[model samples]
Target: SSVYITVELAIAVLAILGNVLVCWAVWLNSNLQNVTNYFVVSAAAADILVGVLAIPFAIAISTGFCAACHGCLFIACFVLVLTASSIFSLLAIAIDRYIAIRIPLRYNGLVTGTRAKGIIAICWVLSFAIGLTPMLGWNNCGQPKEGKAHSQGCGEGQVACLFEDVVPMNYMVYFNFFACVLVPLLLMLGVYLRIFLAARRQLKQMESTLQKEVHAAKSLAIIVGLFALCWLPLHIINCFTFFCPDCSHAPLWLMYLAIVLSHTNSVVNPFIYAYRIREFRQTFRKIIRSHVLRQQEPFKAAAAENLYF
Candidate 1:
């Protein structure tokens, strides 16, 4: 139990701090405020909410299955909202990249600041709607008689067993997977395929501008690949849960393993964003240097201006 508590705490701390730094760096640099960066910021904000509002309660529930008043419900809602928001943010980023690369000239007109802001607002609204389902009694918990909660029954089983029903939750799970995972994945793949073909054609013509486009395409591809890797397992597990409720009967360790793995998406996104985008990396470095060197000059101004580029 102590080991579990310690590990959870460690993970929670890392996720929180990492995501907070991501948001801060992006916000400070100003050069990181492009359409893609907006989505990245949204994702970090969602991850931060998960860290500050969701993970602690999850750790507590995992340890004892206890619902310490309405706190458990609040945490559950927050977790779902954050998860949905993060996924939607990914979807938005993919769409942004797709349009940018697919129609390079119109990318600016299509993904304007006002448009991006509207999309983000919609993402959060949808996240809240999905997260509020359980609280509204649409899927108010009930596990199979011989499931994990029954086996781990430690008087905290009551709340633990709530929302264990596979039917309604399955709808929510599948809807999320399709809307936030499957569709975006297909779109990203299609966009990358076309971008690559176009790049190859332009390369043959030796157009210098095409080289920059190719680089941007490759960078976007890397971001999408990393996002897919981090989320695929979580979506797979969720789907399995729908079809095989008995899967919950597996060892508690296995369940916890899946839970932890699912949460790792939050920890992984910042690394992907920072490493895959040269602009992001440069902006991050400049911000850090300015802060550490205490040189408040054009470096800061340039960083801010570059963020939207």
Candidate 2:
């Protein structure tokens, strides 16, 4: 339990710090505020919310071995919405980058700021709507029968409820995996293939300009690869949990490991963004230094301002 607490604390801290930096960097640096970065900001914001709102419940569930009904339903809904939004935003970013690298000139017209904003808005709206289904009674949540009795403190009511059951829960699980995981993975693969083919063709034609395009394509591919690595296991575990009740017979340690892996994505993403993108590194450094200096020495601002003028 102590190890679990320590690990969860570390993850929560990293998720908060990394994602906040990502959002701040993209927001403050005008040059980094492009369509792809818009999606990055949305994803970072979602991760930060997940860290703040979802991880605490997860920690409770892990150590307490039961849901804490003190707003657990809302927490569940928030977690699902933010997780779905983060995944969808990554898909959007991959698609945007695919278009940008494959067709640079067309990208400017197609993924303008207004259009990007609209897309990000739609992604969050849809994510929330879909995520709210369980909380709206489309699905139910209850305790595991074998577990020691645990108390849930729902607002203005106290009741013992075991696992949630609904007619559509199975169908929803299947549909979510197909719509969120399978489809997005296929789309990313297709786009990367096209990008690779385009780059190869251009290379054969002895186009020197193709080198930069190829590099960008490689970067996009790496991002997609990291996303897949971070998320695919989570989905796989979801599939097992939903479809195979007997799978629960596995040791509690294994279940805990799966849960930990699922949560690790929040910490993994910001590092991927910061390390993979050069602009993010530069902006992150500048922003952190400015904030630190300003916090430590109030007089530094006037001196810096005078130097700038």
Candidate 3:
């Protein structure tokens, strides 16, 4: 419990500050007002929620801050919403980049801000539906047993089903793995790969194309690898737990480690997306300097800059 509590607090502060900066950078500068950036902002918003709500509740539960089912259920749903949103945003980003590289001429005309907004809207609506499912009663997929005791308290040192036994364990295991994890896992990588090959083929004669393609490839590969690192373990454990059902063999320490890694994914995204860009870094310096030394026009025309191209 102490270990997880420590891990949770550290991640929460780090993610909150990083995401706040990202969100502020997007809002304060007009340069980040494009369709791609709007999707980035939505991802930042989801990160903030996970750091604030999900991580805290996880810590709270281990320390007995709330009943097992109540706190755990909410945290699970919040994580569900975040996981769905994060994957969907990444999906949109990959598609956006592919189009930009594959058909630069038609990219802007096809992927407008309005279209991006529609995509983001669909992402959230689907995520909200997944989040509400547990609470609204789709959580329980098991038939009623004749004589099962269905009540327990965390503070009182008794066991609870974490989902009120209303949710079928298999239902959650299947949805999370197939929908949220597998599709995006394969889809994002495939899009990035396609983008890479397309860029290479189109710009095969150019010297600079190698550098650009490699940078994009590096950034995306690092993200996908880390996501696999963070998310895969717990999910693998979930698969076995579903098969074995009520298997306590999974050590608490292992699950806590998985959760800690999970939160780090959101924390690292701001740096990857925003700071990696030369333009955003310049704007960040000015934003920081203006806040500290009271200089206004140092980056007054920040909106005129664009780095994502």
Q: Superposing all C-alpha atoms, what RMSD in Å does each candidate have to the true structure?
A: 8.3, 5.9, 8.3
Query: Which residue segments of model 2 deviate by more than 4 Å?
Result: 63-71, 141-172, 207-209, 288-309
Question: TM-score of each candidate?
Answer: 0.75, 0.77, 0.79
Clashes of each: 8, 7, 4
Order the candidates by lDDT, highest first — what do you get?
A: 3, 2, 1
Clashing pairs in 1: 30-307, 31-306, 31-307, 32-307, 141-162, 141-163, 142-163, 142-164
Which candidate, 1 or 3, has the higher TM-score?
A: 3
- Candidate 3: stretches off by over 4 Å: 63-75, 140-167, 202-210, 246-248, 288-309
lDDT (CA) per prediction: 0.67, 0.67, 0.68
- Specify the highest-lDDT model's number: 3
lDDT of 1 by residue, 1-309 (tens): 666667667777777877777787777676676776777787778777767767675665554354432445656566777877876776677677667767779888788888888999998998888777666655444333334545655355344422233225565576666766677678777777877888888877866558766876776687568667766765676667677877655455656666676676667664565556677667667766767766666687788899968
* Clash total of candidate 2: 7
lDDT at position 62, candidate 3: 52
Task: Compose the digit string of candidate 2's lDDT tens values, residues 77-187.
Answer: 666677677777767777787778767897888888899889888888888887776666655444322223324433233323322221234634676667666777788
> Per-residue lDDT tens digits of candidate 3, residues 1-309?
786788778988888877778888877778877877877777777778778876775565454333344444565676677767766665666667667666778878988988988988888888878766776665542343222333322334223433324445565687767777677778768867875786577676565556666777776676677767867887787787788766665787887887688678778764576777666777777777777655554554453354322
